[PDB]
Amino acid sequence: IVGGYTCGANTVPYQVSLNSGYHFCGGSLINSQWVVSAAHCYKSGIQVRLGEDNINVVEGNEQFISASKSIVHPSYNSNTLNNDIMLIKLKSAASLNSRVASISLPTSCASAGTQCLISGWGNTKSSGTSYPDVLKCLKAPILSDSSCKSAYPGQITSNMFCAGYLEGGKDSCQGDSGGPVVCSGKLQGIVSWGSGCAQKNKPGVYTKVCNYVSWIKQTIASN
Ligand SMILES: Cn1ccnc1-c1cccc(Oc2[nH+]c(Oc3cc(C(=N)N)ccc3O)c(F)c(N3CCC[C@@H](C(=O)O)C3)c2F)c1
Ligand SMILES: [Ca+2]
């Protein structure tokens, strides 16, 4: 997150860190046994870390759980990033509490202008690399389809939405990928891609979760 603020320990209880001996992607806890992330974050040997604040220190409240299976959307296209969504099943259920909680799936898509909270342990710099220890937060609005398309001609599908600031300096970035975009208590987006980070006229692009509710439910039910 570029241009954000320190969230405060366990203030974003559904935030998960995907770990393979280092933090590589975010995710969201949607029930005691399932996490949603981005398909582009897929890899084998994933350990899900719940209840994290400082990802480099064991502070208490953490729960480390291996992934039993990772389900990449069957129509994910690595060239276009269309359908950039993945489901991860935990080997054992998370213990839900004050600090580790699920986030609800949307019932309807969010409109342009809706303010959302984006969070992660990704890069905090536009120019250069600087990874934080603690979780960073950013409040950002969903942009109109028209602005989004103007920014990334021919690259925006019906399964994507733009959120952020055209003036630059505030955005998600590498390392935040697969993490949550929460609007009015519902998971509306997944951090997917953008051209650089916090660059003028190049807002972040997010997987539009409301288009996958049925798919999520159906997939979980059969696994
Ligand atoms: C439209 N489309 C189809 C297939 N790929 C794409 C694109 C196009 C443009 C950017 C895309 O995503 C990308 N997003 C990034 O950064 C991100 C930016 C944002 C944001 N601004 N809100 C969110 C998540 C990100 O992962 C990259 F750093 C990146 N890299 C550039 C190449 C080197 C790579 C690294 O590992 O060293 C970093 C990249 F290709 C993905
Ligand atoms: Ca920790």
Side-chain angles (χ1 to χ4, degrees), residues 51-60 62 64:
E52 285 283 16
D53 187 46
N54 184 323
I55 55 168
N56 290 303
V57 167
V58 173
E59 307 175 281
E62 300 89 349
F64 297 174

Side-chain angles (χ1 to χ4, degrees), residues 40 77-82 152 155-156 160 163 170-178 191-199 202-206:
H40 79 266
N77 183 322
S78 56
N79 316 104
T80 67
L81 287 206
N82 191 34
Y152 296 109
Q155 298 188 283
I156 305 300
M160 300 173 192
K170 298 196 168 94
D171 197 2
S172 53
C173 196
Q174 294 178 284
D176 299 315
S177 289
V191 176
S192 184
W193 62 275
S195 187
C197 313
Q199 298 301 282
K202 293 292 210 194
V205 192
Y206 304 92

Side-chain angles (χ1 to χ4, degrees), residues 90-134:
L90 299 188
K91 169 183 187 123
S92 61
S95 131
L96 305 185
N97 53 44
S98 181
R99 294 102 150 204
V100 172
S102 56
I103 186 68
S104 290
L105 290 180
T107 55
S108 62
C109 304
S111 76
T114 299
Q115 247 81 200
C116 304
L117 180 69
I118 311 169
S119 55
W121 291 276
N123 192 4
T124 64
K125 285 193 176 148
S126 311
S127 22
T129 319
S130 185
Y131 287 106
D133 278 333
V134 309

